[PDB]
Design a binder for this molecule. Sequence first.
Ligand SMILES: Nc1nc2c(c(=O)[nH]1)N[C@H]1C(S)=C(S)[C@@H](COP(=O)(O)O)O[C@H]1N2
Ligand SMILES: Nc1nc2c(c(=O)[nH]1)N[C@H]1C(S)=C(S)[C@@H](COP(=O)(O)O)O[C@H]1N2
Ligand SMILES: [Mo]
Ligand SMILES: [Mo]
Lengths: 372, 372
Amino acid sequence: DPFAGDPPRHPGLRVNSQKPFNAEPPAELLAERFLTPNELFFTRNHLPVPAVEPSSYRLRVDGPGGGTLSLSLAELRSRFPKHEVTATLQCAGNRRSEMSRVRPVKGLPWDIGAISTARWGGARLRDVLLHAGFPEELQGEWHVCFEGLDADPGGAPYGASIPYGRALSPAADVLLAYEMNGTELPRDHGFPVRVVVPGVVGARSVKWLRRVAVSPDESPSHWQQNDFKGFSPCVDWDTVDYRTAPAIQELPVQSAVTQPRPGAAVPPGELTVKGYAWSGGGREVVRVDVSLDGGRTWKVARLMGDKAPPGRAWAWALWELTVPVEAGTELEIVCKAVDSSYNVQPDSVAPIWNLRGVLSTAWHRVRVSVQD
Amino acid sequence: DPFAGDPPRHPGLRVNSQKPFNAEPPAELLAERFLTPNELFFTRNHLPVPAVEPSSYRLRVDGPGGGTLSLSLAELRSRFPKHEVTATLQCAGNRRSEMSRVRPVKGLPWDIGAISTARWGGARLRDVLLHAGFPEELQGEWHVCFEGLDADPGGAPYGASIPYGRALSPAADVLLAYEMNGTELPRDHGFPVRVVVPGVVGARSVKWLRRVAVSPDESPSHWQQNDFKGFSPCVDWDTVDYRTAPAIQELPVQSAVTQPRPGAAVPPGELTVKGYAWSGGGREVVRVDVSLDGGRTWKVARLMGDKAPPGRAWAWALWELTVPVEAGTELEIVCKAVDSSYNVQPDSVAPIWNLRGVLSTAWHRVRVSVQD
Ligand SMILES: Nc1nc2c(c(=O)[nH]1)N[C@H]1C(S)=C(S)[C@@H](COP(=O)(O)O)O[C@H]1N2
Ligand SMILES: Nc1nc2c(c(=O)[nH]1)N[C@H]1C(S)=C(S)[C@@H](COP(=O)(O)O)O[C@H]1N2
Ligand SMILES: [Mo]
Ligand SMILES: [Mo]
């Protein structure tokens, strides 16, 4: 069994695939803490988890002229000043199951928890690339390609890329992380080194980093070219042309209700409704509207968190709103967020439906009853 | 009459206010050309149009230490290399009248034409500020405040501000424009000098520029502090607190159908449906979906224009889609756009309604009939 050497996990997760392991935290715990504990942070593995001996590990970094820099773990820790960045990672497939309610799609059936937040510690990718000898600025459109140590039976590594400009920007905070919430990177989350690309879809944060290369083109890997793209609702498996749509990088504004859960019976008097909101590209969440009546009327929620600098809101905003609730009534609790560019979430899922089930950002709706 | 010295205008505009002058081009002409002719470009004036003698004109630029640089028109033309930027300006109030259909709002009743596109020529604001002696980077959050020559009866100039970072960024393309579509700036559009802030709401592109100042704070002017902000649908005139929401800078993804027009009877066979789409923040439009049946099914439109570099799509994308149409049928033509961060437009207007009528980006719907 290629998966026999996989790490053990916390017993209470919502697992949607054992092999490869793909799991999200229970929704009742997801927004309990601003920083998701390591043991609960959602896990998305395409492949078996690599088993890495720390001391023999080398990160290969290809330089401008085609020479190869080779960095040990200890050298990554000591050569470059450690930077810490608190960033939310969200999988493209988050809330996919709601898309499937409209018309079935292919993909891991994620509920609202394919998103988590951690403080990440590591080398700035910018610094590593300058050390390899690259300039601030290359002419034209360049990309930094990443390969992980995990590979399919045919030998193709997990791979992704980001634009060179984002890799080199001080403000974009792209990390080669070896620390997660103050402890060393767990195996499931990329031990010993992962890329963390703040404000950008989870897919680009390559775990178990083996190689960093600079190229005139995007990553040639199947996951960069033939996956993680959004399409019209009209597109099906027979008509899909992956060249017609851009690789997802930044994600659009997103939110969900974590408390209370669908089907609940809640006591009369006061109900505290909680959830999360987040947007891609470092765009702050500026407002979260909450409705108890299926989105006819709304009240403004309270946003928690400490504000980040402009253009650098990498971390989700947790929200809450305490409302009065009348004995023996039905509620449809809906939330929607607004980011600093004043993007908004769409009303319904059908018009954003796509064959891959990605980019599921329509209002989250939770139906509950009030007890008597 | 304070408006007697105002310029004459093209006879065929859709004027919503004579004094001060506020007008949009007819929708049938709006998307006819990629670059909106100067005579048709939408005009938004809060005040009488300033009468400016070109030679005695001086732009005041305050330097780092509180000294004042003073620049003539000729010096602005000769001192700094002319840069050309093609950018769409969209008023916050675009498509306000559709918001009013839900619940009446205060404001100029714009239809879909409070948006236009031009190639702008001028000094990079970045270069002017470096010449005044400012550094690449100031510590903390700084703003560049602009004042126009137009003032109210009490003497307060039109004013706005943008973040310092955007003013200094080579890639953000902020201009002090003295040329518009290859000719000198018309009076209505800011003669002799206006700021052009690409990817950002029209309000910040100060016309008739008199002063540029660098400040630790946003512009203190009423239009920066107590206007151009988005609010929840629940907020009314008695509850509004302008400190709770950020000044609009970047605008969200937007589109409209320009052809055919509401109420039309069209011939059977083939119908070419045309419109525009655009997004704030230099985010490209990557797809436009069009529906003939009120948004139940959709087809992908054709996007026209030449692609801009990543993060710099300042100009709208014009779109078209030719469809078959059956004799004696009713159509509800709807469009929606998707930007490069995969933001989308919301289904309906009520949930985005606000008391100022700004930020009106729900699907544009056009009802027509087919002849027999
Ligand atoms: N090497 C490698 N990196 C990877 C993946 C993978 O399968 N292999 N999955 C990607 C995807 S699709 C997501 S959403 C994130 C999930 O990161 P997490 O497991 O730490 O939450 O990792 C990304 N990085
Ligand atoms: N000096 C000055 N600048 C101004 C205005 C104004 O009233 N005075 N209107 C602003 C607003 S709200 C908009 S939408 C744009 C409109 O620019 P246009 O008239 O060239 O289309 O100008 C902006 N710049
Ligand atoms: Mo993912
Ligand atoms: Mo405006």
